Amino acid sequence: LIANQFNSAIGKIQDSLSSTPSALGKLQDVVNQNAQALNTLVKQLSSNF
Amino acid sequence: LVKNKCVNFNFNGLTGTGVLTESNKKFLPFQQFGRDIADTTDAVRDPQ
């Protein structure tokens, strides 16, 4: 029973982490904020000041 | 005109330093200067 429960839990994690909108927002926010900061630095290089 | 090499250009008053290559994109007939992004001259039309 313990082995079956562990195997089922691992399978459920694989199914839940394969719906294309799983809980990976904390990892995506870091890359998104770094890209936003870089793009904003470029866009403020565009200004004439 | 010497393409595929780094050169200072003064195209129609625009002074700058950089290498130019050959592109295959098509511009509109009414466009001469080109600032694709970030307030810099990506493209410019050679008057000749």
From Swiss-Prot, chain B:
It comes from the Viruses. Attaches the virion to the cell membrane by interacting with host receptor, initiating the infection. The major receptor is host ACE2. When S2/S2' has been cleaved, binding to the receptor triggers direct fusion at the cell membrane. When S2/S2' has not been cleaved, binding to the receptor results in internalization of the virus by endocytosis using host TFRC and GRM2 and leading to fusion of the virion membrane with the host endosomal membrane. Alternatively, may use NRP1/NRP2 and integrin as entry receptors. Binds to host ACE2. RBD also interacts with the N-linked glycan on 'Asn-90' of ACE2. Cleavage of S generates a polybasic C-terminal sequence on S1 that binds to host Neuropilin-1 (NRP1) and Neuropilin-2 (NRP2) receptors. Interacts with host integrin alpha-5/beta-1 (ITGA5:ITGB1) and with ACE2 in complex with integrin alpha-5/beta-1 (ITGA5:ITGB1). May interact via cytoplasmic c-terminus with M protein. May interact (via N-terminus) with host bilirubin and biliverdin, thereby preventing antibody binding to the SARS-CoV-2 spike NTD via an allosteric mechanism. This is Spike protein S1. It comes from Severe acute respiratory syndrome coronavirus 2 (2019-nCoV). The chain holds residues 533 to 580 of 1273 of the full protein.
